[PDB]
């Protein structure tokens, strides 16, 4: 940023010693939206709904 930033989404932190998936989750959802509104996007928030899958035996 002290070199000309287009910081579209504030940094996010993960503490391995506590709740790394909480924070990773917070930063992520906030993140997609920051960039969404920014430009636009392709899956919002929509979805991709391909909760993908496979199992057959």
């Amino acid at each position: 940023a002290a070199k000309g930033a287009e910081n579209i989404a504030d940094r996010g932190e993960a503490d391995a010693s506590d709740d790394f998936e909480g924070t990773y989750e917070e930063w992520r959802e906030h993140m997609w939206s920051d960039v969404a509104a920014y430009f636009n996007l392709d899956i919002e928030n929509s979805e991709d709904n391909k909760s993908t899958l496979s199992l057959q035996f």
């Binding site: 709740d19 998936e21 909480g22 989750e25 917070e26 909760s51 496979s54 199992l55 057959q56």
Partner: protein, 58 residues
Amino acid sequence: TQLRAMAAKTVCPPHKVELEALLEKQAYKEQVLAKRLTMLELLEKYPACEMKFSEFIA
């Protein structure tokens, strides 16, 4: 991901509300991560969650 998969196979409406409650940031930290609550223990708690073995394993 595991909780959503279970919620989606749950035909116990209040039981679906509870599994979804666990997705919230605070509940997830305090009731899932702090106590190390597993998918297996939730399947035992919810015998009418229609998840099947092959979806479990995967």
